[PDB]
Short mmCIF file of C-alpha atoms and ligand atoms in Angstrom, two decimals:
data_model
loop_
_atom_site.label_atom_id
_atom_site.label_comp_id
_atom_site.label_asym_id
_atom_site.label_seq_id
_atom_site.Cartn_x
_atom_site.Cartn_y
_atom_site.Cartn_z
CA UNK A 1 -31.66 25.06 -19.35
CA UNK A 2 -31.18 23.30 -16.15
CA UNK A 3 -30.16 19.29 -15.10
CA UNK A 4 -31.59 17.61 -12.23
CA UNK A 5 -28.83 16.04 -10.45
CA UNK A 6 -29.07 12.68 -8.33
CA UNK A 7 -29.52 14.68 -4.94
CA UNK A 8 -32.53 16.17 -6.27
CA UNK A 9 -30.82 19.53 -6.85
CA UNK A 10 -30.47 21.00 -10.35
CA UNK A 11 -27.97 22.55 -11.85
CA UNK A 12 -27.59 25.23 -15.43
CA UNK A 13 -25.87 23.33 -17.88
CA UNK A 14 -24.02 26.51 -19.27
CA UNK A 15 -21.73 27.59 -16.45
CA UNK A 16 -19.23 30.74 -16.61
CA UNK A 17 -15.39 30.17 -15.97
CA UNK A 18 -13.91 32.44 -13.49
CA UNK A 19 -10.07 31.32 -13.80
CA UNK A 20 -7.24 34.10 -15.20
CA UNK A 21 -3.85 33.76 -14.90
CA UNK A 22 -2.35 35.32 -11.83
CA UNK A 23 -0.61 38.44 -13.99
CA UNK A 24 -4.85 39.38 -14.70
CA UNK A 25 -5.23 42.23 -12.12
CA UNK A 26 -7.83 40.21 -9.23
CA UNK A 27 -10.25 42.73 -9.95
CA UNK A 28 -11.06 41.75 -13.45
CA UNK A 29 -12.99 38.91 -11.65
CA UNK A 30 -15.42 41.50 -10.37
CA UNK A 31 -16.27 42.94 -13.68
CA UNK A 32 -16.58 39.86 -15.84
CA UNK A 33 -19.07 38.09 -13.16
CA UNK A 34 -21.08 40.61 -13.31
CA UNK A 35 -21.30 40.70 -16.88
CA UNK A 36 -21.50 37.24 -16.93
CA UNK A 37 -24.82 37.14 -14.73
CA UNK A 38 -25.87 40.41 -17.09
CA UNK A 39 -25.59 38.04 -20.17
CA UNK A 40 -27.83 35.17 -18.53
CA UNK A 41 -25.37 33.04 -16.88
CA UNK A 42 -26.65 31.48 -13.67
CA UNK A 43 -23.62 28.72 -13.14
CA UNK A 44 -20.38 30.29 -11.79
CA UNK A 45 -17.71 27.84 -11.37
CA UNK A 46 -14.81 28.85 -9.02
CA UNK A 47 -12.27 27.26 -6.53
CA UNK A 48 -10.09 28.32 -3.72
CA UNK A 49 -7.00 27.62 -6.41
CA UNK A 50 -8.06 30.43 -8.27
CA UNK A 51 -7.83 33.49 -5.77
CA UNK A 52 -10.88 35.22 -7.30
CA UNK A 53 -13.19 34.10 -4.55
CA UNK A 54 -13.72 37.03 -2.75
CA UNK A 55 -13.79 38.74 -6.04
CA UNK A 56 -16.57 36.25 -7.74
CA UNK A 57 -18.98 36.57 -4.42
CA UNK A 58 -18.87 40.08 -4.44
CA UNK A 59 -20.19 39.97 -7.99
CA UNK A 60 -22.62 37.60 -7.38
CA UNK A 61 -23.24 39.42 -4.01
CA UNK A 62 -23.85 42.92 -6.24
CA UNK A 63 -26.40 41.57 -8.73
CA UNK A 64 -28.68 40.12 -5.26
CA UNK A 65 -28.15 43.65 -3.86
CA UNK A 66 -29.46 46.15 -6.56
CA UNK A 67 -32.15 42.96 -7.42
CA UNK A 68 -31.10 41.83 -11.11
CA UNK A 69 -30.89 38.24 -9.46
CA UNK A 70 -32.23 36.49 -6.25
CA UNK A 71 -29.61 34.01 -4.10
CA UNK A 72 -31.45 30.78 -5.08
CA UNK A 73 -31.25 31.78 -9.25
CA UNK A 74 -27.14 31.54 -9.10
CA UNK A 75 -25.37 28.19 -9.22
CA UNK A 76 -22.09 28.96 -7.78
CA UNK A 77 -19.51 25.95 -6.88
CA UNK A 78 -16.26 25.89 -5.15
CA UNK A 79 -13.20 23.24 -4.65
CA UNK A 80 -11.18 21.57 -2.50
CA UNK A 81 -7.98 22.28 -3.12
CA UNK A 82 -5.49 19.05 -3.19
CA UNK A 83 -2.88 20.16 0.05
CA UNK A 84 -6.73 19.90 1.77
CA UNK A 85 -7.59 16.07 1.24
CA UNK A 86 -7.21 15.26 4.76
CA UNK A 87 -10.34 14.51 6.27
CA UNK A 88 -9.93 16.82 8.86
CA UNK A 89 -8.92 19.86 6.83
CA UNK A 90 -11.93 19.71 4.52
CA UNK A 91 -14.74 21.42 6.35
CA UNK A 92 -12.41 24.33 7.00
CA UNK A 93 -11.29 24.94 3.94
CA UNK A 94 -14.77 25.02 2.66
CA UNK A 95 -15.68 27.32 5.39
CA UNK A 96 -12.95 29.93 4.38
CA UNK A 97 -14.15 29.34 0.92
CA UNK A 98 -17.80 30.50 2.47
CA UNK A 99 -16.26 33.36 4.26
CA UNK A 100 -13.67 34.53 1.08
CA UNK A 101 -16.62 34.98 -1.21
CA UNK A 102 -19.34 36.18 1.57
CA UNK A 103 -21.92 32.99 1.37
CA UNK A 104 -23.64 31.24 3.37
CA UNK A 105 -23.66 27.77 0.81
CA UNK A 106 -22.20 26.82 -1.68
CA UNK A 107 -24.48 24.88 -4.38
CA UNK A 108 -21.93 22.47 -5.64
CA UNK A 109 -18.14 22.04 -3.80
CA UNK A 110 -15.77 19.43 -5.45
CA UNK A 111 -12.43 17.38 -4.73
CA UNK A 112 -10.01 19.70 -7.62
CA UNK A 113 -8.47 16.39 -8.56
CA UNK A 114 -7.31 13.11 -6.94
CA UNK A 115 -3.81 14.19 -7.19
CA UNK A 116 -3.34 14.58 -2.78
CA UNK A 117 -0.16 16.79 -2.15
CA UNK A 118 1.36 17.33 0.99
CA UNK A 119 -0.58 19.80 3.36
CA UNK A 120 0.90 23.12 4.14
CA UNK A 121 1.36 26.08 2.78
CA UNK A 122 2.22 25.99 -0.34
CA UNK A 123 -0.42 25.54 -3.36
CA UNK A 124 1.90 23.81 -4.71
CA UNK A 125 4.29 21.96 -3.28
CA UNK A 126 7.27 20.60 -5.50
CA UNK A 127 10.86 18.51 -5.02
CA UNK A 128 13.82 19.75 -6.33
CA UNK A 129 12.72 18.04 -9.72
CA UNK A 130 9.93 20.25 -9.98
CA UNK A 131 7.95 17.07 -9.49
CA UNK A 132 4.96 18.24 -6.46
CA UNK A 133 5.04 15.89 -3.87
CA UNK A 134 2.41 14.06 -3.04
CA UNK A 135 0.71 12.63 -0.46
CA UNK A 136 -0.57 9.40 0.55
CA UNK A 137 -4.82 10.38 1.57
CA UNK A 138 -7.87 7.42 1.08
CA UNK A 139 -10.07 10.02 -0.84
CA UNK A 140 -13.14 7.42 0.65
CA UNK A 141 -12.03 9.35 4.07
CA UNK A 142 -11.88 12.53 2.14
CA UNK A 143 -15.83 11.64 0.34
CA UNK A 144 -16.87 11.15 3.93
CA UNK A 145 -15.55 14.68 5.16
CA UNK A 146 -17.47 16.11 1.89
CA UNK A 147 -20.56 14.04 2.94
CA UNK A 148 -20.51 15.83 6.42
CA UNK A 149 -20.37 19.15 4.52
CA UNK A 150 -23.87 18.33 2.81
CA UNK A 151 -24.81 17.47 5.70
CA UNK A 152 -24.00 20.45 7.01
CA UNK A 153 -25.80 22.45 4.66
CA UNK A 154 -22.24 24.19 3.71
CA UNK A 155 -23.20 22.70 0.52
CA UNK A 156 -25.72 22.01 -1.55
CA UNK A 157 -24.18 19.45 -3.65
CA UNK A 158 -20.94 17.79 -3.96
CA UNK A 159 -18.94 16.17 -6.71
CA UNK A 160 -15.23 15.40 -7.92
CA UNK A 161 -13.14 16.93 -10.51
CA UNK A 162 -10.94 14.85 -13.02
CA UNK A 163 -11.76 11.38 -11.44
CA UNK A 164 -11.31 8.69 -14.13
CA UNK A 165 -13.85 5.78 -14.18
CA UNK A 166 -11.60 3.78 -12.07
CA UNK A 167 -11.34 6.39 -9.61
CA UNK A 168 -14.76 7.32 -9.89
CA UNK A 169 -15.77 3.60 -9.16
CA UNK A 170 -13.91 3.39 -5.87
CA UNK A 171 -16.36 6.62 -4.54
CA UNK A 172 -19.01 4.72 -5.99
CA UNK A 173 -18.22 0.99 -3.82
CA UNK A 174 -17.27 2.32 -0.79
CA UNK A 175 -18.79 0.77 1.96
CA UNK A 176 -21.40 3.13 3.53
CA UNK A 177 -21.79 5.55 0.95
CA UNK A 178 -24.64 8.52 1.55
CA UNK A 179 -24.49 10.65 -1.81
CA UNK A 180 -22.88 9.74 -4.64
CA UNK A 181 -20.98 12.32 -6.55
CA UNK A 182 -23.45 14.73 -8.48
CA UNK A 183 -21.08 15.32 -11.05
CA UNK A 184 -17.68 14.55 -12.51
CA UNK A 185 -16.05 18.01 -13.85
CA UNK A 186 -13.05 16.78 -16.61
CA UNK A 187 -11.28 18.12 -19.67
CA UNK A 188 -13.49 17.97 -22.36
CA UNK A 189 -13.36 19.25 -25.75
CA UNK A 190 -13.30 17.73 -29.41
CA UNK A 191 -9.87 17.09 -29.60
CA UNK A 192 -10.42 14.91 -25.94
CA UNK A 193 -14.25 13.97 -25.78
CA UNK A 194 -14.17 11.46 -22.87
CA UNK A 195 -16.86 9.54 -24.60
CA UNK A 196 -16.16 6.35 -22.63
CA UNK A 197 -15.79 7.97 -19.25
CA UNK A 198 -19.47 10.21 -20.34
CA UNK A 199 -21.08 7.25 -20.81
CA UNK A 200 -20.27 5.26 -17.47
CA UNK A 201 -21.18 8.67 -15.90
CA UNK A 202 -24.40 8.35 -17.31
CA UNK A 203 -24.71 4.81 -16.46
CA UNK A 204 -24.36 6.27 -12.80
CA UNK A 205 -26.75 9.62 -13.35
CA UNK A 206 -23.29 11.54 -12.52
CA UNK A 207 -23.00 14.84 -15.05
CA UNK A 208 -20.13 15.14 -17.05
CA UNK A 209 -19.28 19.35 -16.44
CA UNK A 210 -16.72 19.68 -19.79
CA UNK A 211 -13.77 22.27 -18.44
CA UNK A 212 -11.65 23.85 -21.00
CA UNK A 213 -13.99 22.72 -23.85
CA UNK A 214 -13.57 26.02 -25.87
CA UNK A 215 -9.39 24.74 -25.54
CA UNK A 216 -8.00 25.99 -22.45
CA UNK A 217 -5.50 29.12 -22.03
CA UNK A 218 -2.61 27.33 -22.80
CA UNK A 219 -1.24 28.13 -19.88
CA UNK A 220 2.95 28.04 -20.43
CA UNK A 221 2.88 26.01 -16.97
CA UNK A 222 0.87 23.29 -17.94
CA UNK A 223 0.35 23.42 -21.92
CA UNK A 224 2.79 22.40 -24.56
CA UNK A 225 2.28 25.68 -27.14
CA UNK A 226 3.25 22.98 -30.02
CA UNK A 227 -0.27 21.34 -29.07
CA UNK A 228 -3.04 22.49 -31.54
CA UNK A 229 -5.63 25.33 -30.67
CA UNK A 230 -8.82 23.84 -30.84
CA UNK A 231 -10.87 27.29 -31.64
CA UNK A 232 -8.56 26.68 -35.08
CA UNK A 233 -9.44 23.45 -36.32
CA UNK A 234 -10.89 23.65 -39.42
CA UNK A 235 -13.84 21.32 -39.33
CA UNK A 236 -15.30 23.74 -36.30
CA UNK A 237 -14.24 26.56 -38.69
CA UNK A 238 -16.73 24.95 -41.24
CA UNK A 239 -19.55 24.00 -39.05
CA UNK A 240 -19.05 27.82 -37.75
CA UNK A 241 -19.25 28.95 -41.41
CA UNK A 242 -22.61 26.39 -42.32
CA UNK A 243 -24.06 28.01 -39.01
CA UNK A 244 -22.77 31.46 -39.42
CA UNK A 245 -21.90 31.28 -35.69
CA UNK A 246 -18.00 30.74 -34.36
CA UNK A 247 -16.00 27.92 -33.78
CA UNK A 248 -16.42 28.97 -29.79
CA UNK A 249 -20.40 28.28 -30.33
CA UNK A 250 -19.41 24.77 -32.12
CA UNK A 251 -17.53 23.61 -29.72
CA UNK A 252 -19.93 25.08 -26.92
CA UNK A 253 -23.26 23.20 -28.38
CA UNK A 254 -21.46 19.74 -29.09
CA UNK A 255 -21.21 19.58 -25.59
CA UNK A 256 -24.58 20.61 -25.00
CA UNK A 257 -26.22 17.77 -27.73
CA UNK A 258 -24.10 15.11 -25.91
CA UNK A 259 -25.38 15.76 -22.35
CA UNK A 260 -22.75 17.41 -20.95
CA UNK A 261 -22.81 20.64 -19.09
CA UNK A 262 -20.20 23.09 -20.38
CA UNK A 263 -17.99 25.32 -18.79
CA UNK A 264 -16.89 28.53 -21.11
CA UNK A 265 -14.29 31.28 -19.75
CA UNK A 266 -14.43 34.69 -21.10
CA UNK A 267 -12.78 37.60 -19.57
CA UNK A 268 -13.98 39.80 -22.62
CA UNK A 269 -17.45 41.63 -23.05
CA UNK A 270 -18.33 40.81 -26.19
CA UNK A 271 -17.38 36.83 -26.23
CA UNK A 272 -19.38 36.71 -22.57
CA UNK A 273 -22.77 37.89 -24.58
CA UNK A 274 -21.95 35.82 -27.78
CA UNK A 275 -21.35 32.51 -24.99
CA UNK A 276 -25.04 32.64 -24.21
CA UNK A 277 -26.01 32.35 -28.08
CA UNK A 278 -25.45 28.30 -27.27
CA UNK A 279 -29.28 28.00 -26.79
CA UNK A 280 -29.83 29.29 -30.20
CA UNK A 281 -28.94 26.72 -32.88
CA UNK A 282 -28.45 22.84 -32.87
CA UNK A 283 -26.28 20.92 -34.95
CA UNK A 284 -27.23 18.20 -37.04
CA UNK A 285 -26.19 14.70 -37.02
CA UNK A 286 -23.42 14.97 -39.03
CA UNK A 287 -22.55 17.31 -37.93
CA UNK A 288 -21.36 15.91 -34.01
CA UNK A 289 -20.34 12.99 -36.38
CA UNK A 290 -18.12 15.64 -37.60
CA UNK A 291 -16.60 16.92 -34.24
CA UNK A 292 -16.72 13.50 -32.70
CA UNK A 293 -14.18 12.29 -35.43
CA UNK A 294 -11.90 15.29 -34.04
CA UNK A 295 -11.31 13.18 -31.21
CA UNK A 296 -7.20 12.46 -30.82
CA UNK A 297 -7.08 12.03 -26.88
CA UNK A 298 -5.17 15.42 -26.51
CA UNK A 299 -5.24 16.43 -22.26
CA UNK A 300 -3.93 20.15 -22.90
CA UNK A 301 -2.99 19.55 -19.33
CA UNK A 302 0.38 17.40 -19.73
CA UNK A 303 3.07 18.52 -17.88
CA UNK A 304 5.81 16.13 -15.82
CA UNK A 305 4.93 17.94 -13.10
CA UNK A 306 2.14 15.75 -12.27
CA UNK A 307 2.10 13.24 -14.79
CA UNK A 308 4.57 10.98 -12.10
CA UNK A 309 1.68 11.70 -9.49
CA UNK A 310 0.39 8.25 -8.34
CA UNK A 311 -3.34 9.20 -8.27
CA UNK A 312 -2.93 10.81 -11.85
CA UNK A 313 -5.90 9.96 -13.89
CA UNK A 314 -4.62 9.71 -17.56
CA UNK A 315 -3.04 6.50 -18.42
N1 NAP B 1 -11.60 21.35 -12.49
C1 NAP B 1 -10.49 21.76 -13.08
O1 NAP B 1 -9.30 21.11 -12.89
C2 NAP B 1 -10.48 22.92 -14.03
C3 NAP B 1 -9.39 23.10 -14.86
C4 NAP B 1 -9.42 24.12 -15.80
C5 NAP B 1 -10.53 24.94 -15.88
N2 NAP B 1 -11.58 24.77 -15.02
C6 NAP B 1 -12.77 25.65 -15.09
O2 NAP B 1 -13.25 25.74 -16.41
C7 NAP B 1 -13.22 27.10 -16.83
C8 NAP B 1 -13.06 27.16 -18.34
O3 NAP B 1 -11.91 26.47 -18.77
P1 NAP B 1 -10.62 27.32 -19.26
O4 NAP B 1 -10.39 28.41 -18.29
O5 NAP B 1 -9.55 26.35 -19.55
O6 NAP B 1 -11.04 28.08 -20.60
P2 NAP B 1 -11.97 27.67 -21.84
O7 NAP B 1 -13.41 27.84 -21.45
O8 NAP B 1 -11.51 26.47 -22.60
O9 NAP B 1 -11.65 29.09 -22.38
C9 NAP B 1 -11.21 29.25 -23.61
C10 NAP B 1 -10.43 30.52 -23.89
O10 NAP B 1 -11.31 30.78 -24.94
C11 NAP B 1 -11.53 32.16 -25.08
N3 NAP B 1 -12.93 32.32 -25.49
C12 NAP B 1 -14.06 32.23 -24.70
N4 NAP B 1 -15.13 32.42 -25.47
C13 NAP B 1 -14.71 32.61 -26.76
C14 NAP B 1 -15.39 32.86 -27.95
N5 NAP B 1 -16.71 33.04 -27.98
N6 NAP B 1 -14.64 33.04 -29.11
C15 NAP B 1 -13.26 32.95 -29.09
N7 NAP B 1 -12.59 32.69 -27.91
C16 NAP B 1 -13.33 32.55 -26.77
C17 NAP B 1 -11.20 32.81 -23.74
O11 NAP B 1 -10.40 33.96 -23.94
P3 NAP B 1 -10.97 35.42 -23.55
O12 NAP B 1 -11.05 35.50 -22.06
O13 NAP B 1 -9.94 36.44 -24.11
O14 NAP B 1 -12.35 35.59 -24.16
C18 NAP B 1 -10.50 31.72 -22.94
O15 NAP B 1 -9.22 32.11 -22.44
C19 NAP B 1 -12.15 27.77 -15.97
O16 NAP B 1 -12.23 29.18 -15.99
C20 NAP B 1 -12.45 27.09 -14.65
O17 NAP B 1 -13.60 27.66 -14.06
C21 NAP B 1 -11.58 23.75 -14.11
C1 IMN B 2 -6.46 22.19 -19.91
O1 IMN B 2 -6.05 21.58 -18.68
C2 IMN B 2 -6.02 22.32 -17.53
C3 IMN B 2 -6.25 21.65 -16.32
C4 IMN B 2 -6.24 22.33 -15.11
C5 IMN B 2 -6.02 23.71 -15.07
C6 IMN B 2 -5.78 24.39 -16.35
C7 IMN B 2 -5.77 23.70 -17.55
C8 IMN B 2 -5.53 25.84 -16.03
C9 IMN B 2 -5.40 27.07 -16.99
C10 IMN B 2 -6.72 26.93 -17.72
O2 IMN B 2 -7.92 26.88 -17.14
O3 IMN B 2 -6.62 26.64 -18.92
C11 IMN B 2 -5.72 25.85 -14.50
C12 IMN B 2 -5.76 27.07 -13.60
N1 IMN B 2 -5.95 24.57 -14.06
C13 IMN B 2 -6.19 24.24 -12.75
O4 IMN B 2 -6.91 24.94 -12.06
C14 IMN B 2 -5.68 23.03 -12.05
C15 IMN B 2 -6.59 22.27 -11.31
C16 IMN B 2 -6.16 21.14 -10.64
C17 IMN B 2 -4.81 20.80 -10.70
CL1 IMN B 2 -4.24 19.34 -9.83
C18 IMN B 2 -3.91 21.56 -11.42
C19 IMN B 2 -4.34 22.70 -12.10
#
């Protein structure tokens, strides 16, 4: 159930999603992690983007208290949000990451995404376009700062988050380098499968870590609603049906038979407990034959918004 990374460290290759949409009251966090870590997940994949951080520790913080789980069972990872590239800014903002969700290390802490914006105060800083305005930051400099957080021991492990191979590459040359990236965390579901970028990762020992592979929430900001929902296609509706599991559980163990460590959100009881049920079947063959042919190079993420970005990794 677990990888070994190429620092030596090992990660659970079913990790829980802790992002909801800011008009989800913060304390839903709370309940769902614990649940989560009640169902069997170990991996709990936040970021400073998400404002559930104090919310997320406490859970995980709850479950060491009363003795269900012990500190070095839980994989929990954070991120660098993109106003933070700046060398300088990156140990502090994985410090208040430490101190919003009560830890003393984080196992994993990524760059969010190559995309630098302008440091400040704003998450997200836009133009009067509605374009957000970037900024111009070496992200070797930035690798270095994330370096000095292993280092550190603030972190266990560090990676990047939707990198494309090119990108990826330039971590990989610089001059110097002390760790490589452990991982590479991308959109990745049948309708996008990232085949090509999975296997240079591999060629690298990186992980592929698949985020929104159950679909994504379609988020209005971000998501065009004419796009389709993945959990609907009918070929996982089939393999669901020739399983008698869901199209969720499909999607969730193609990932799995590939070698790539899934990600699955659930704010809801029931779909947290039937999440774990990934370890319980395999699919055949022709069956990922099946899914793989699904593949139609749909980012659910696609808004103008970044898609001018110069660092934006789709082409
Ligand atoms: N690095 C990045 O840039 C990045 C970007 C996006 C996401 N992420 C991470 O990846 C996580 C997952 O991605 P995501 O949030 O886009 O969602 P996802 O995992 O693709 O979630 C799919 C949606 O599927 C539903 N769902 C979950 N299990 C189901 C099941 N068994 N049957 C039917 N529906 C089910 C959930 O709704 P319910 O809650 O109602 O169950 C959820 O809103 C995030 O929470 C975050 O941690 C990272
Ligand atoms: C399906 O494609 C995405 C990609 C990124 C997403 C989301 C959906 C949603 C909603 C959801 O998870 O579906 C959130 C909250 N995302 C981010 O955190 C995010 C991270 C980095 C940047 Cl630069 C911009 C946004």
């Amino acid at each position: 159930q677990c990888v070994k990374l190429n620092d030596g460290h090992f990660m659970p290759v079913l990790g829980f999603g802790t992002y909801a949409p800011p008009e989800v009251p913060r304390s839903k966090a709370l309940e769902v992690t614990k649940l989560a870590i009640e169902a069997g997940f170990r991996h709990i994949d936040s970021a400073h983007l998400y404002n559930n951080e104090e919310q997320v520790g406490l859970a995980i913080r709850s479950k060491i208290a009363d003795g269900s789980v012990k500190r070095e069972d839980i994989f929990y990872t954070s991120k660098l949000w993109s106003t933070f590239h700046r060398p300088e800014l990156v140990r502090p903002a994985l410090e208040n990451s430490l101190k919003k969700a009560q830890l003393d290390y984080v196992d994993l802490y990524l760059i969010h995404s190559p995309m630098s914006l302008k440091p400040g105060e704003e998450l997200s800083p836009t133009d009067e376009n509605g374009k957000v305005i970037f900024d111009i930051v070496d992200l070797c400099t930035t690798w270095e700062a994330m370096e000095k957080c292993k280092d550190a021991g603030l972190a266990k492990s560090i990676g990047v988050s939707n990198f494309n191979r090119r990108q990826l590459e330039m971590i990989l040359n610089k001059p110097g380098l002390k760790y490589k990236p452990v991982c590479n965390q991308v959109e990745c579901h049948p309708y996008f499968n990232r085949s090509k970028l999975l296997d240079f990762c591999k060629s690298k020992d990186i992980v592929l870590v698949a985020y929104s592979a159950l679909g994504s929430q379609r988020d209005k900001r971000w998501v065009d609603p004419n796009s389709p929902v993945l959990l609907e296609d009918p070929v996982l509706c089939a393999l669901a049906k020739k399983h008698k599991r869901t199209p969720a559980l499909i999607a969730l163990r193609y990932q799995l038979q590939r070698g790539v460590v899934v990600l699955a959100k659930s704010y809801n009881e029931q779909r947290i407990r039937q999440n774990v049920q990934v370890f319980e079947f395999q699919l055949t063959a022709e069956d990922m034959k099946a899914i793989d042919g699904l593949d139609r190079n749909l980012h659910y993420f696609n808004s103008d918004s970044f898609a001018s970005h110069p660092n934006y990794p789709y082409s």
